[PDB]
Amino acid sequence: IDHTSKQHKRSGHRTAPKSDNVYLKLLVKLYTFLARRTDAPFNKVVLKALFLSKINRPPVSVSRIARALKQEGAANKTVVVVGTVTDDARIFEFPKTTVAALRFTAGARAKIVKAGGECITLDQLAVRAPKGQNTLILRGPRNSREAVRHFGMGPHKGKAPRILSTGRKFERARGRRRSKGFKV
Nearest distance from C-beta of residue 3 to RNA, angstroms: 7
Number of residues that bind RNA (CB under 7 A): 106
Closest CB to RNA among 26 and 116? 26
| 123 Cβ neighbours under 8 A, 6+ residues apart | 26, 27, 30
In the shown chain, the binding pattern of residues 134 to 173 toward RNA, with x for contact by CB under 7 A and - for none, equals xxxxxxxxxxxxxx-xxxx---x-xxxxxxx-xxx-xxxx
Nearest distance from C-beta of residue 26 to RNA, angstroms: 9
Cβ(17)–Cβ(50) below 8 Å = yes
In the shown chain, the binding pattern of residues 80 to 119 toward RNA, with x for contact by CB under 7 A and - for none, equals ---xx-xxxxxx-----------x-xxxx-----------
Query: What are the DSSP calls for 42-63, one per residue?
Result: HHHHHHHHHH--GGGSPPEEHH
Nearest distance from C-beta of residue 47 to RNA, angstroms: 12
Closest CB to RNA among 124 and 153? 153
The residues facing 137 across adjacent strands are 80
Nearest distance from C-beta of residue 179 to RNA, angstroms: 4
Closest CB to RNA among 75 and 116? 75
In the shown chain, the binding pattern of residues 117 to 136 toward RNA, with x for contact by CB under 7 A and - for none, equals --------------xxxxxx
Closest CB to RNA among 114 and 179? 179
Look at strands 98-100 and 118-120 and give their pairing.
Answer: parallel
Between residue 22 and residue 81, which ones bind RNA under the rule CB under 7 A?
Answer: 24-25, 28-29, 32-33, 36-37, 40-42, 45, 53-56, 58-61, 63-64, 66-68, 70-74, 77
Rounded Cα distance between 42 and 80, Å, is: 10
| 66 Cβ neighbours under 8 A, 6+ residues apart | 91, 93, 94, 95
Rounded Cα distance between 181 and 154, Å, is: 17
| 109 Cβ neighbours under 8 A, 6+ residues apart | 119
